Amino acid sequence: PDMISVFIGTWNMGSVPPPKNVTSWFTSKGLGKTLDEVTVTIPHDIYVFGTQENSVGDREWLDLLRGGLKELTDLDYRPIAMQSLWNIKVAVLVKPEHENRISHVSTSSVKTGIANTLGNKGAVGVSFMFNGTSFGFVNCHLTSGNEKTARRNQNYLDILRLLSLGDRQLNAFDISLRFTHLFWFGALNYRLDMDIQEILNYISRKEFEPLLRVDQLNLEREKHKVFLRFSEEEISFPPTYRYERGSRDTYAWRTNVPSWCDRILWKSYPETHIICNSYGCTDDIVTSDHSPVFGTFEVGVTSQFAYIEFESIEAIVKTASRTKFFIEFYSTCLEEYKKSFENDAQSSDNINFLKVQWSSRQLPTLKPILADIEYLQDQHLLLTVKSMDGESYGECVVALKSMIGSTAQQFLTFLSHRGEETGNIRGSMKVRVP
C-alpha cells in the first residue's frame, strides 16, 4: 500500500463503562470537522484509542473495541499493542492484512506526580513501523484545575523527556524527533480563561473563536513552552467538558468552566504526506461527563528494503559556552551512526548565541544501505549537535527528498533540546547515485 488511513480517538470515560454502541466515535460522526457525509464506511487501516478514567478492566476493554470494530467492519482487527497506567489506557488495532507489515513494536508509560492534588496523572505510549515509516502514539492525562497551567506544562516536559518509546540508539533524541509521525493526544486539561456564564453564552451561539482566543493550550503553544512545531486541526466543535450524564443538553456547574480538555496534536518529519480528514466530537455518547473526540489522518508510507556528501554545515546555537562542537548523524538508512570532526570556524556577536561552521573536510560521507532512488527520497537524517568536553545542545531532522542529485542543495531547519528552541542549522548537501 501507498497510503494508510489512521484513526485516533481520545475519551475521558468518567469512571463508568461505555454504552453498548460507540459507532459515532469510530466513524467520526458528530460535531466539528466530521465524516457525516460518508454513507458507506471505509474501514480505517489503523485504529488507535486513548482513554482516561477508564475503569473497565484492560482485557474486557480491548475485547469491547475488537467487538465494536468487528460489528462495524466485518473484520477481525488485530491489537498490536496495549499499555495502561492506572486508568490511563491506550490500545492500537490494525487490519488482519497489515499484520505482516508491522514491526519494531514498543510500549512505555510515565508517571508525573504533583503533591496535594489528585494524582494518577501521566502517560502511556505505543510505537511501531508500518513497512519503513515509524509511528508514535502518546495518550496522557495531565494535572487538572483552572490555575494549574504551569503544572500542566511541566507534566508535558516530563513526558517529553522520560517516555522511552522507540529504539534505544535514539537516546540523544526525545520522542518529538524519534518517529516519522507522532500523535500526542489525551486529557490535556488546559482550560478557558473566562467566567462561566460568558462561556455558556458563546457555546449557545456556536461562536467558538472568542473562546479559542482564551484557550490555555493555545496560549501556551504561542509562548513556545509546549508542543513546539506541532499541528492541531482547527476546532469547530463545542467544549467537551463538563456535561451532565444522560444528555448533551446541559453543562454541569470556576471549577466546572466548560473547556476543550480533550485534544489531538501531531508532529511529522518534513516533506511527508499527512492530511487531517476529520477532527471533532460525538454528541450521542452520554455515559461520561466528557464527550469522545475523534481525529482521522491520511498518511504516506514507504516500502521496506551511493553516498551522502556535505559541502558545509553552519549552526546558530543558543549557549554561553565557547568550546568546540561536532555533529552525530543517525538514520534508519545507515548501517552505523557517523560523527563529524571539530568545527573549524566560530564567531559570535551575541552573549547568548554562537555561530559554528564545519567545512567539507570536517564532515564525513554517509553510506546508505541501499542505492535505490525511490528508497532514498523517503529517508531522513537526525542530527545532534554536541560539545567536545561532552550533553546535546540541539537536535533536528533533515529530509533527503529534494537532495537527490549531482550538485549540492540547500537545507535549513530548527534546533531543539528539551522542549526549547535552541537555534537553527543550515548547510549544503547531495545524495549521489552512480
Numbering used by the authors: 421 to 673, 682 to 733, 746 to 830, 832 to 875
From the paper:
Co-crystallization experiments using the catalytically inactive SHIP Ptase-C2 D607A mutant with Mg2+ and substrate failed to reveal clear electron density for the substrate. Although our co-crystallization experiments did not reveal bound substrate they did exhibit electron density corresponding to a Mg2+ ion and a phosphate group. The Mg2+ ion is on average displaced by 1.3 Å and the phosphate by 1.7 Å compared to the Mg2+ and 5 P positions in our model. The position of the phosphate does not leave space for an attacking water bound to D607, hence this could represent the post-catalysis positions of the Mg2+ and 5 P. Similar to a recent structure of INPP5B, we observe in our Ptase-C2 D607A structure the Mg2+ displaced on average by 1.3 Å from the A towards the B-site and a phosphate group shifted by 1.7 Å from the 5 P location towards the attacking water. As suggested by Mills et al. (2016) this likely represents the post-cleavage position for Mg2+ and the 5 P, since there is no longer space for the attacking water. We note that the movement of the Mg2+ seen in INPP5B and SHIP2 from the A towards the B-site is opposite to the B to A-site movement proposed to occur during catalysis in AP nucleases. In this complex the catalytic base D607 stabilizes a water molecule for 5 P attack.
The two main enzymes responsible for PI(3,4,5)P3 degradation are the tumor suppressor phosphatase and tensin homolog (PTEN), which removes the 3-phosphate (3 P) and the SH2-containing inositol 5-phosphatase (SHIP), which dephosphorylates the 5 P to generate PI(3,4)P2. The SHIP Ptase domain belongs to a family of Mg2+-dependent inositol phosphatases with specificity for 5 P dephosphorylation of inositol rings. Here, we report the crystal structure of SHIP2 containing the 5-Ptase and a C2 domain (Ptase-C2), revealing that the two domains tightly associate via an extensive interface. Importantly, even in the absence of a localization effect, the C2 domain provides activating signals to the Ptase active site, resulting in a significant increase in catalytic turnover.
